[PDB]
Structure 1
Amino acid sequence: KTVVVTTILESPYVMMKKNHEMLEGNERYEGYCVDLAAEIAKHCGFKYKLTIVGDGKYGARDADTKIWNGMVGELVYGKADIAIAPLTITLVREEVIDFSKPFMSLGISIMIKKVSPIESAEDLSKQTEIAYGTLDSGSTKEFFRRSKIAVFDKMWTYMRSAEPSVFVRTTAEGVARVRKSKGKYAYLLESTMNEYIEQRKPCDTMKVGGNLDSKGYGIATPKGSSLGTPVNLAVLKLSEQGVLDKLKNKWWYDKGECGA
């Protein structure tokens, strides 16, 4: 009985190698999440199959319908057994799926094309000359929707009432938008992906400010599943012997195809 694993096409977590057209099975995928899934299977001792989520959405619940899309929907509705992917641990998602202990710390950061006048987030909210956006159906957008800090509510009020839409469909599309905006558009994304982008050639984007908050990535399992304890123990073990640190160093700093 193989285990269906739901992932997303996001770098450096999952890459579609370079010759996927002439490869079969999981051998056509590479990345941090593929290595993490391999280690999880090695510790637990189960066969796994890598399946991409049908819709390129991390997961959210749409109001007035009460339905889930993406990996979270693929988990609550029994379409997959485990989600080794950069899924943010949030209060809403925990009520419907089980989150393991975080395996990668993260924070909300602001990145712009290459002293930067943006500086911190409050100045970005005050300065309306330069626009800022957020990935569609992500934890950042839901974080800003339910935020209560006055500055964060100002940012949310600006984003929900803007023309055209400041939101972006995919992270790569947001990177392209910020690169092609000549410093007129800003992107709010996770610290890990932003760092990976800023350490990659041509290196036309940089991180500004600090981290708005602190979150984490966890291995997701369906509610009431028997895999929660083994995957939690495996994540704890990997953190104890630093396999996660080695994987992050390999996939974030070993290549270093940038000037730094």
Structure 2
Amino acid sequence: GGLTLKVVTVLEEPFVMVAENILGQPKRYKGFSIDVLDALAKALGFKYEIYQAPDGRYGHQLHNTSWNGMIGELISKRADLAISAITITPERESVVDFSKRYMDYSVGILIKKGTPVRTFQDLSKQLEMSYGTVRDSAVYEYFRAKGTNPLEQDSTFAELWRTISKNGGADNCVSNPSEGIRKAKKGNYAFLWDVAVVEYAALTDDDCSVTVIGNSISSKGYGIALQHGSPYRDLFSQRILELQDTGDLDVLKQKWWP
């Protein structure tokens, strides 16, 4: 009894990960997004089968107006749900329907302990520490937008962008989150990136040498993406609000970010 939904996902520590497996058998999944999905499956009484996006991509719009990745899996109706660390953005909202957020998203600073930095303003005033983000990423473009905005109340973001975009972004940016995390652990670099990812990187650091400055900029939300016009989006949203208000979301959050 009950419906089964096909869920497309992408591996993203600690949201979605591969659980125990024997080579050749179907893959199980674990993580914060998986626990949320299980809570919603219990609340709404449905089963689900997970598969990873064939291209391992969240998705982008192609020149022919089609989308790849998970979003493409939703538009093509090959998936009923998409869940991982999907930020709720206008670009995506135009082609798929999102549930209400079950966690907040923002950009934060991975940096070694002991520095006198607590805000992005502070970081923008520093002299001895280089800093940057992933080249040609949504975060990079966010700092581009904020840095070229003359309506900015103060100079913080123009400075941040001046350092980030140095020499076309070659000097101070990295190629992927691993390079930035490790470079910040190396001691003379601050890595600006997703607060959740970076925070997991700090919590699991063996040397306990880094910390996350989360000043809550570029604040969006992680949501569940469904097909446009899906009849389940409202149920998912309401159930998420009720999990948020009952205390379960904070328990799972503390579970995967100990």
TM-score, with structure 2 as normaliser = 0.79
1:93-112 superposed matches below 5 A: 93-112=92-111
Q: Indicate yes or no: 2:188 matched with 1:188.
A: no
CA drift of 1:53 comes to: 2.4
Q: Indicate yes or no: 2:229 matched with 1:244.
A: no
Change in Cα spacing, 1:200 to 1:100, as seen in structure 2 (3 Å) is: same
CA distance in 1, matches of 2:171, 2:129: 13
- The corresponding residue for 1:168 is 175
CA distance in 1, matches of 2:205, 2:248: 27
CA drift of 1:153 comes to: 4.8
CA drift of 1:204 comes to: 2.5
The range that moved more, 100-109 or 152-161, is 152-161
Change in Cα spacing, 1:209 to 1:29, as seen in structure 2 (3 Å) is: closer
CA drift of 1:82 comes to: 0.7
Partner deviation per Cα, 1:192-219 (whole Å, 9 max, x = no partner): 2222222223123212362224321111
- The corresponding residue for 1:217 is 222
CA distance in 1, matches of 2:135, 2:53: 15
CA drift of 1:61 comes to: 4.0
The answer as to whether partners of 1:111 and 1:208 remain within 8 angstroms in 2 is yes
5+ unaligned residues in a row in structure 2: which ranges?
A: none
Change in Cα spacing, 1:213 to 1:162, as seen in structure 2 (3 Å) is: closer
CA drift of 1:177 comes to: 3.5
One-letter amino acid of the structure 2 residue matched with residue 32 of structure 1: F
Change in Cα spacing, 1:240 to 1:124, as seen in structure 2 (3 Å) is: closer
One-letter amino acid of the structure 1 residue matched with residue 21 of structure 2: H
- The corresponding residue for 2:7 is 5
- The corresponding residue for 1:257 is none
5+ unaligned residues in a row in structure 1: which ranges?
A: 254-260
The answer as to whether partners of 2:132 and 2:191 remain within 8 angstroms in 1 is yes
One-letter amino acid of the structure 2 residue matched with residue 188 of structure 1: L
CA drift of 1:241 comes to: 1.9
The answer as to whether partners of 2:11 and 2:84 remain within 8 angstroms in 1 is no
The answer as to whether partners of 1:59 and 1:137 remain within 8 angstroms in 2 is no
* Equivalent residue pairs, number: 247
- The corresponding residue for 2:32 is 32
One-letter amino acid of the structure 2 residue matched with residue 187 of structure 1: F
1:72-83 superposed matches below 5 A: 72-83=71-82
State the identity as a percent.
38
CA drift of 1:135 comes to: 4.2
Change in Cα spacing, 1:11 to 1:96, as seen in structure 2 (3 Å) is: same
1:1-260 superposed matches below 5 A: 2-17=4-19, 19-22=20-23, 24-25=25-26, 28-61=28-61, 66-116=65-115, 118-125=117-124, 127=126, 130-135=129-134, 139-147=138-146, 148=149, 149=152, 151-156=156-161, 158-160=163-165, 161-163=168-170, 166-169=173-176, 171-179=177-185, 182-202=186-206, 203-208=208-213, 210-253=215-258
One-letter amino acid of the structure 2 residue matched with residue 166 of structure 1: C
CA drift of 1:156 comes to: 4.1
CA distance in 2, matches of 1:209, 1:32: 20
TM-score, with structure 1 as normaliser = 0.79
> Counterpart of 1:20 in 2: which secondary structure?
coil
One-letter amino acid of the structure 2 residue matched with residue 163 of structure 1: A
> Counterpart of 1:88 in 2: which secondary structure?
coil
CA drift of 1:4 comes to: 2.0
Root-mean-square deviation over aligned CA pairs: 3.0
Change in Cα spacing, 1:201 to 1:151, as seen in structure 2 (3 Å) is: closer
One-letter amino acid of the structure 2 residue matched with residue 200 of structure 1: T
